[PDB]
Amino acid sequence: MASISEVIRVSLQQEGRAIAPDNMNAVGIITGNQGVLSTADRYRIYRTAAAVASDFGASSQESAFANTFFDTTPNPISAGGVLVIGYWRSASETVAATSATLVSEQTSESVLIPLLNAINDGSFTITVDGGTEQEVTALDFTGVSELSEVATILNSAITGATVSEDNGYFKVTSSTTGATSLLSYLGVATSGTDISAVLGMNSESGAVLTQGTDQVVLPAETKLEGITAIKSEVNIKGAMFIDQILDADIPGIASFAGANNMLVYEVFDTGYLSKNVSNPVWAVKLAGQSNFRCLLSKSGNRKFAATYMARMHTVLFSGQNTAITMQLKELSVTAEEYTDTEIANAKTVGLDLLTTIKNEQALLTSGANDFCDNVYNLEAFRDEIQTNNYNLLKTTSTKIPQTDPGMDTIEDDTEKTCEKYVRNGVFAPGTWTRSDFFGDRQQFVDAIAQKGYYVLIGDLADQTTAERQSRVSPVIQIAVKNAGAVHEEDIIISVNL
Amino acid sequence: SVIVYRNNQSTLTLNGYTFQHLYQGAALVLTPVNAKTARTNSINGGVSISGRVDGGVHTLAIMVQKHSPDDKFLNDAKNSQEPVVFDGSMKRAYTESGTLKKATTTLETGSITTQPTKTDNNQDPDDSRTYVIEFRNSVETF
Amino acid sequence: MRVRTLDDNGDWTFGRGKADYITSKKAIAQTVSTRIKSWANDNPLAMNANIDWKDLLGRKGTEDTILREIERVVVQTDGVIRVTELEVIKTEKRVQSILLSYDTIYDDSE
Amino acid sequence: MRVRTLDDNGDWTFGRGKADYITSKKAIAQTVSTRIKSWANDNPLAMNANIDWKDLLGRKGTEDTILREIERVVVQTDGVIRVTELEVIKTEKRVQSILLSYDTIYDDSE
Amino acid sequence: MSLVNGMVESLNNTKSETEIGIGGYRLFARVRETVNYRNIVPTDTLEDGSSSTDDIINEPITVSIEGVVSNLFVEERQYPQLVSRDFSAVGEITALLPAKSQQQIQRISQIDSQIRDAVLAAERAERLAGKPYEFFGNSGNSAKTEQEKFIDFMEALYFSRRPTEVSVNFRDYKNMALVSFIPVRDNNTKDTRFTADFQQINYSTLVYTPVSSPSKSVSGKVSDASNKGGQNPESNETGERSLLSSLVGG
């Protein structure tokens, strides 16, 4: 039965496109439940509700938050973005004892097999549990068509351990758990053509050899500042916590939001609609923590943050004027009912509201703290100038010489980025209202008023010789003016009685 | 850069016959006849950039000696009963920063368009023939 | 044209029939004043009731279209003739206040 | 539109009448999935059944026309609206795998 | 008729900033752009000298747009075209409908799932009536170059035989019908130079309608009694089903 299938196959997409959080819209939800994300598995990346469910179950609140996330119609994955679930140790994680592992090099299966099929005899030296050195002197790899088969061969060869293949990796795990070192990286044997080096298991090769950890280990109970562990692994650009951040810890994370060039969204209930110092949200507003976005939900409905996050990080920063404001945009959560006094207080404190008008959502966002628009857009701009300068220092085969033409290169690239983000709707030309500048004030103000951005790079001869042999480029000063978006309208009728 | 040629005028080959006799002066002039990409401006402000299909068609102008075998070859091509197709290349050997290098300009699907203007002068003779071939596609590379 | 007057805060008025009705030149004033306030896809009985706000205050770069649509609503009102309207503050925080002036069909009797 | 479901390997299903039928949004999925697989001059009852494979995988330089014909088949399907498809690998040995994404008439109810 | 109507419905088409193109396909360049307001003024000297005016019959505006489409168009400054909302259930008014049992409800659910598959396409079409581009949609396939997209969209609009909305600067006319579409391809430029004449389909309401444009949820509800012609059911063959066995007795 020679099927049609061997000239065409038509199946369903299986892996979630396996992308990585590169763009700005790589948003996170931090759980604290040690169901599947334990330490050293601090994050998982998703682009659909169902996968989050299958790893989390439609019952666990984490899948619920994913459901209210992806349900926002212009959700992040529609503009080059991902969702990522983090994990902060809420209470006394118990990491089960592992067994020693040995992950081999990334082998393409198009080169490993042709090299293997010529190797008649086998040759391994492996050690498990530090036992007697084991030498494998016969592995008739001739009859092999895929890495699963060489995996089976190695499984039959290495006594005391199991061999598996997984996404082109060769994992080798000893049976015993706890102080179970696989001392060998598949060293050279006394006879037989060496398979070790070609596999990638070799010690000189880039093979991870995580030794069997000691028996069951207790990490202590961390603080919400454990978000740092997520941030130092994922390049999240917007995060939430399933569990509400305690008051005493809000400033810290708030500072964190600024210091890591990211956003953190956190919701508070009705009791925080004051402007006293003790009220943490106003403490954030006074501290200037513009990256710690505060949201308001009368019921306490935490999910309001996720959808809000899922509504913000949704702008493809490459088309024209794709920079969006926030107010009056459809979310994935039922609005709540607020009085006029409390909604005014929320406006004047910094919180944000998804309030009913008539069965119809109305998102009203504050400007007490800087508008989520402005903070998010400025973060995108810093990220994009960083990316463009990095791509310039990466692209060229030469070294980008420390000459004035080189600085003109770098300044032109920065100006190209600025022009993109003016075409992008974020910054628009206007009369620079602040009272500080970089160079010629006339030059500066004219450039802002006509192009919207200014990029001045100091010349080489204006830096110390300590900063000249440090191979560091001069200070690049760029100034921008936010576009003048509108949120309300106070139409005044001119009375003629 | 520092560019030192050899054999001042580039070596021209057509139909497996390499021009060993070029006039002094503008021996070879490869003029592209049409603009590469034509563009149009919209009312709103955008621009529509579009490559010309004529983007490659070049005219190679050749100044051969008034009766040297190169003139005989080009004249025989001119006098053929049916237009003859030329498919050759201009190769120039040169050194950059002291490294030997070659620049190749392949000429594809040409025919003699503008015939030479034959002049025999007394006071100051002009013993040149300028054959202008119009290759469909000329690609330089190096 | 008659129309029921609204009190200061803009709630309805019942009682004093034929007397809670605005007569003219003020009926036009009230009717323009709250024609501006009629979001478009609100009324199932008039889904293009007036200008679309949820799709104009929720998108960047609509000030010109806000103004054009306000002129559209005002001019297409039974009783007005001309308009004279522009923006007076520049989003003093982020709220812009526009000034709208129109010549009713009255005050043209010379 | 109903259509009999096919099991994993794609053979037919009998029994459970009115229940082996795919309801919707998956009926479109199945019907596109095996409209792609319908060689043209196969069916004597529809000789232009779908795109012609024996004359497109047997000739050099048809990738663009493979893609255009796949878009033709998919778009001309009862239940689809748009497509978004391109080639993801580059004949990893000599087999190229293309990625085809289409928006059914469902999931547009807002 | 009235002089007042002039300004009133002259502003009735306001151009949004997003600048819909030939219906959402703005990915070309407008080399030229004209509109033709015409009028029929009856010629001979009008009869009375007192009141025999009201004799300037109006005309269907035509809009001519000639432009060029290239493989690579870079648009200068225009806001994204966002998908219009499905505001169909704005007045949807249930809860007066009867109480009926389960799997009497769910039987209705299956019927609804059964004919939504056959109606929802045209429902979306009418929802997106003016603008065909986001109905047909971005082509989405990497094989088809940009001129592919322009030609197949234009053919879809032309075979669609549905009026589209066309924007000349300062106006987004609401019901333009594609009258003539001539794309030309010189042999000295790979682009396509196309001239498209549209003609407005202006149509007013003869009959008393209190509601201008209601939701789909009340559009039939406020409809006046529609009229269909007669027909002779006794003389039909295409459905001459016999009498149900449950009726012959009764």
Short mmCIF file of C-alpha atoms in Angstrom, two decimals, chain E residues 24-226:
data_model
loop_
_atom_site.label_atom_id
_atom_site.label_comp_id
_atom_site.label_asym_id
_atom_site.label_seq_id
_atom_site.Cartn_x
_atom_site.Cartn_y
_atom_site.Cartn_z
CA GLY E 24 -9.01 49.27 2.56
CA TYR E 25 -6.33 48.57 -0.02
CA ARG E 26 -4.20 51.67 0.43
CA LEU E 27 -1.00 49.88 -0.59
CA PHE E 28 -0.71 51.74 -3.89
CA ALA E 29 0.07 55.33 -4.85
CA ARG E 30 -2.56 57.78 -6.11
CA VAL E 31 -1.08 59.43 -9.19
CA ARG E 32 -4.33 61.28 -9.84
CA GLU E 33 -7.66 61.53 -8.06
CA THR E 34 -10.82 63.21 -9.35
CA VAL E 35 -14.51 63.44 -8.55
CA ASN E 36 -17.21 64.50 -11.02
CA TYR E 37 -20.21 66.30 -9.58
CA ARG E 38 -22.72 66.65 -12.40
CA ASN E 39 -26.21 68.10 -12.69
CA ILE E 40 -29.07 68.11 -15.17
CA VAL E 41 -30.47 71.59 -15.51
CA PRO E 42 -33.37 71.54 -17.97
CA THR E 43 -32.47 73.90 -20.73
CA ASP E 44 -35.35 76.03 -21.96
CA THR E 45 -36.09 79.27 -20.15
CA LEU E 46 -38.15 78.41 -17.07
CA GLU E 47 -41.81 79.20 -17.30
CA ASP E 48 -43.04 81.50 -14.56
CA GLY E 49 -41.09 84.47 -13.30
CA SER E 50 -42.23 84.01 -9.71
CA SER E 51 -41.82 80.48 -8.39
CA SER E 52 -41.04 77.98 -11.16
CA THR E 53 -37.69 77.03 -9.62
CA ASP E 54 -36.62 73.65 -8.15
CA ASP E 55 -35.29 72.34 -11.44
CA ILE E 56 -31.69 71.26 -10.80
CA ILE E 57 -31.85 67.47 -10.82
CA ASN E 58 -28.87 65.93 -9.07
CA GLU E 59 -26.60 63.22 -10.47
CA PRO E 60 -24.51 60.26 -9.33
CA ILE E 61 -21.07 61.49 -8.33
CA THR E 62 -18.27 59.55 -10.00
CA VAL E 63 -14.81 59.24 -8.48
CA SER E 64 -11.79 58.45 -10.66
CA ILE E 65 -8.58 57.21 -9.07
CA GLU E 66 -5.54 56.39 -11.16
CA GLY E 67 -2.48 55.16 -9.32
CA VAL E 68 0.34 52.66 -9.45
CA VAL E 69 0.97 49.46 -7.53
CA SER E 70 4.49 48.20 -7.00
CA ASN E 71 5.99 45.18 -5.31
CA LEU E 72 7.26 47.40 -2.49
CA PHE E 73 5.11 50.30 -1.32
CA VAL E 74 6.26 52.27 1.71
CA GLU E 75 3.39 54.21 3.21
CA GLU E 76 4.37 57.51 4.78
CA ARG E 77 2.02 58.44 7.61
CA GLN E 78 -1.24 56.61 8.08
CA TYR E 79 -2.86 54.96 11.07
CA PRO E 80 -3.58 51.23 11.14
CA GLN E 81 -6.87 49.91 9.83
CA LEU E 82 -8.55 48.22 12.78
CA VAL E 83 -11.20 45.55 12.48
CA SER E 84 -14.67 46.96 12.99
CA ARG E 85 -16.59 45.64 15.96
CA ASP E 86 -19.46 43.14 15.78
CA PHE E 87 -22.09 45.33 17.35
CA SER E 88 -24.96 42.99 16.52
CA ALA E 89 -26.11 42.08 20.05
CA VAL E 90 -26.39 45.71 21.17
CA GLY E 91 -30.16 45.53 21.45
CA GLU E 92 -30.46 41.74 21.53
CA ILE E 93 -33.43 41.28 23.80
CA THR E 94 -34.03 37.79 25.15
CA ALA E 95 -35.66 36.74 28.45
CA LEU E 96 -39.16 37.34 27.15
CA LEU E 97 -38.88 34.19 25.04
CA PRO E 98 -40.61 31.10 26.40
CA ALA E 99 -39.49 28.72 29.09
CA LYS E 100 -38.69 25.46 27.30
CA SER E 101 -37.08 22.32 28.67
CA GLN E 102 -33.56 21.02 28.24
CA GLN E 103 -32.86 19.25 24.92
CA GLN E 104 -35.76 21.33 23.85
CA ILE E 105 -33.38 24.23 24.41
CA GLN E 106 -30.46 22.18 23.21
CA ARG E 107 -32.34 21.08 20.11
CA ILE E 108 -32.52 24.77 19.30
CA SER E 109 -28.81 24.98 20.07
CA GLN E 110 -28.09 22.29 17.49
CA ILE E 111 -30.31 24.01 14.93
CA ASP E 112 -28.46 27.26 15.60
CA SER E 113 -25.05 25.62 15.25
CA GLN E 114 -26.49 24.01 12.14
CA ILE E 115 -27.51 27.11 10.20
CA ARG E 116 -24.97 29.54 11.62
CA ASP E 117 -22.56 27.59 9.43
CA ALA E 118 -24.67 28.62 6.45
CA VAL E 119 -25.57 32.22 7.35
CA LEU E 120 -22.62 33.65 9.27
CA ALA E 121 -20.60 34.25 6.10
CA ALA E 122 -23.18 36.59 4.61
CA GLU E 123 -23.78 38.05 8.07
CA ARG E 124 -20.13 39.06 8.25
CA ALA E 125 -20.38 40.32 4.68
CA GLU E 126 -23.21 42.68 5.60
CA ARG E 127 -21.37 43.66 8.77
CA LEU E 128 -18.40 44.60 6.60
CA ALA E 129 -20.51 45.81 3.70
CA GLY E 130 -18.81 49.08 2.87
CA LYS E 131 -15.24 47.91 3.27
CA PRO E 132 -14.32 44.77 1.30
CA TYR E 133 -10.62 44.72 2.11
CA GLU E 134 -10.86 43.44 5.65
CA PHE E 135 -13.55 41.06 4.44
CA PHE E 136 -11.32 39.50 1.81
CA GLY E 137 -8.40 40.25 4.11
CA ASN E 138 -4.67 40.56 3.78
CA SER E 139 -3.61 37.76 1.47
CA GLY E 140 -1.31 36.32 4.10
CA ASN E 141 0.68 34.04 1.78
CA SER E 142 4.35 34.77 1.21
CA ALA E 143 4.30 33.45 -2.36
CA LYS E 144 2.08 36.18 -3.75
CA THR E 145 3.95 39.43 -4.27
CA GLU E 146 2.24 42.75 -3.70
CA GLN E 147 0.92 42.96 -7.26
CA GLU E 148 -0.67 39.58 -6.77
CA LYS E 149 -2.44 41.09 -3.78
CA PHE E 150 -3.60 44.17 -5.64
CA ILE E 151 -4.87 42.23 -8.64
CA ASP E 152 -6.64 39.53 -6.66
CA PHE E 153 -8.24 42.07 -4.34
CA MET E 154 -9.40 44.16 -7.28
CA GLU E 155 -10.84 41.11 -9.02
CA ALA E 156 -12.54 40.07 -5.78
CA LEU E 157 -14.07 43.53 -5.43
CA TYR E 158 -15.10 43.57 -9.08
CA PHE E 159 -16.66 40.12 -9.14
CA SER E 160 -18.14 40.82 -5.73
CA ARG E 161 -20.62 43.17 -7.40
CA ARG E 162 -21.07 44.87 -4.07
CA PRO E 163 -20.56 48.61 -3.64
CA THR E 164 -17.46 49.69 -1.75
CA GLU E 165 -16.43 52.83 0.06
CA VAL E 166 -13.77 54.95 -1.60
CA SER E 167 -11.77 57.78 -0.06
CA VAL E 168 -10.60 60.78 -1.98
CA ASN E 169 -8.71 63.11 0.28
CA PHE E 170 -11.17 64.97 2.53
CA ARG E 171 -14.05 62.53 1.81
CA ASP E 172 -14.68 58.84 2.41
CA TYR E 173 -17.65 58.26 0.14
CA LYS E 174 -19.77 55.47 1.49
CA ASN E 175 -21.28 53.50 -1.41
CA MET E 176 -19.10 53.56 -4.49
CA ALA E 177 -19.68 50.90 -7.12
CA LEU E 178 -16.68 49.85 -9.17
CA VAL E 179 -17.46 51.10 -12.67
CA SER E 180 -14.19 50.63 -14.54
CA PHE E 181 -10.86 49.14 -13.52
CA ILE E 182 -8.07 49.28 -16.10
CA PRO E 183 -4.63 48.05 -14.98
CA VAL E 184 -1.84 48.65 -17.47
CA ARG E 185 1.66 47.18 -17.51
CA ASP E 186 4.19 49.03 -19.64
CA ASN E 187 7.28 47.14 -20.76
CA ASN E 188 9.50 49.70 -19.04
CA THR E 189 8.29 49.44 -15.42
CA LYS E 190 7.38 46.35 -13.43
CA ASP E 191 4.62 48.21 -11.56
CA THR E 192 0.95 48.30 -12.56
CA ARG E 193 -0.69 51.61 -13.46
CA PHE E 194 -4.41 51.32 -12.80
CA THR E 195 -7.35 53.64 -13.40
CA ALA E 196 -10.53 52.93 -11.43
CA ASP E 197 -13.75 54.88 -11.91
CA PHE E 198 -16.37 54.39 -9.18
CA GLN E 199 -19.90 55.73 -9.16
CA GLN E 200 -21.84 56.50 -6.02
CA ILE E 201 -24.99 54.55 -5.34
CA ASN E 202 -27.05 57.25 -3.67
CA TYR E 203 -30.46 56.08 -2.49
CA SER E 204 -32.89 57.83 -0.15
CA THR E 205 -35.83 56.52 1.88
CA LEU E 206 -39.27 56.92 0.35
CA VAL E 207 -41.27 55.49 3.25
CA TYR E 208 -41.82 56.53 6.86
CA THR E 209 -39.02 55.03 8.96
CA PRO E 210 -38.72 56.36 12.52
CA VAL E 211 -35.39 54.58 13.03
CA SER E 212 -32.57 55.48 10.66
CA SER E 213 -30.24 52.50 11.12
CA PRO E 214 -30.98 50.04 13.92
CA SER E 215 -29.07 47.05 15.19
CA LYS E 216 -29.39 43.70 13.54
CA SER E 217 -31.24 42.77 16.72
CA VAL E 218 -34.13 45.12 15.94
CA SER E 219 -33.70 45.71 12.22
CA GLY E 220 -36.41 43.23 11.34
CA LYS E 221 -38.35 44.17 14.45
CA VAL E 222 -38.93 47.75 13.25
CA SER E 223 -39.35 46.74 9.63
CA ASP E 224 -42.64 47.67 8.07
CA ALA E 225 -44.89 45.04 6.51
CA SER E 226 -42.92 43.83 3.50
#
